[PDB]
């Protein structure tokens, strides 16, 4: 996150850090004691060396660490140039007992619509400057949902954002999630509700003609359910 502020330590107990040899790759949100929802494009990886770390603020510090028993990509997932259905569900090789620092974020209803204008945030440990290095500490950013017809404008996403994608804006020119931030949960509204999962941008994180975009959770709540076995 470029231009975010540090979170209060442990104020977002649902954050996961998906890592490869203790090196952080993407965020993820904990949607059940045994499952973390992240972005599919994060998993283009040798799974043996992957770990989920839970309960974190400082990135180099223990936290609760889990092995992954199964990485389930959305069935209709298409990578770049498509980058469609960019979700994957990671299964923990243990089971979380909720606590003060580790706790799951609830799913939205399937009927939830994320209307333009919605006030949201987005936490992540990703880069804090173009070309730079990951954040030492979990940070956050305020994001407003823009109108999709308008992000699809030829100068912006030029037609390529589908109904399941939520287009986003900071308050400023110079704030943007960035390398390392995908998989992070977009939460919206007063009651801080799960709304999306970060997916992509363009190469320059703050590019104003390429607002960041996340995948709405609601349209995939059903699948999340079937996969996680609950209802």
């Amino acid at each position: 996150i470029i231009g975010g502020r540090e979170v209060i330590p442990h104020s977002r107990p649902y954050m996961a850090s998906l890592q490869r040899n203790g090196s952080h790759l993407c965020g993820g949100v904990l949607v059940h004691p045994k499952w973390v929802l992240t972005a599919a494009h994060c998993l283009a990886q040798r799974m043996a060396q992957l770990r989920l770390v839970l309960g974190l603020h400082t990135l180099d510090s223990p936290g609760l660490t889990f092995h992954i028993k199964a990485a389930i990509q959305h069935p209709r997932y298409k990578p770049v140039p498509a980058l469609e259905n960019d979700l994957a569900l990671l299964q923990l090789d243990g089971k979380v007992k909720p606590s003060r620092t580790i706790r799951p974020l609830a799913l939205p209803s399937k009927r939830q619509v994320v209307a333009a204008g919605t006030r949201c945030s987005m936490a992540g440990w990703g880069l804090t400057h173009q070309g730079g290095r990951l954040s030492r500490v979990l940070r956050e950013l305020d994001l407003q949902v823009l109108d999709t017809r308008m992000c699809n404008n030829s100068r912006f996403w030029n037609g390529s954002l589908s109904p399941s994608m939520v287009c986003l804006a900071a308050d400023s020119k110079d704030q943007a999630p960035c390398k390392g931030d995908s998989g992070g949960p977009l939460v919206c509204g007063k009651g801080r509700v799960l709304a999306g999962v970060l997916s992509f941008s363009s190469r320059v994180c703050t590019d104003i003609f390429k607002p960041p975009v996340a995948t709405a959770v609601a349209p995939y709540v059903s699948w999340i359910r079937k996969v996680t076995g609950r209802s």
Partner: peptide, 4 residues
Amino acid sequence: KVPL
């Protein structure tokens, strides 16, 4: 699209 550069995925993050």
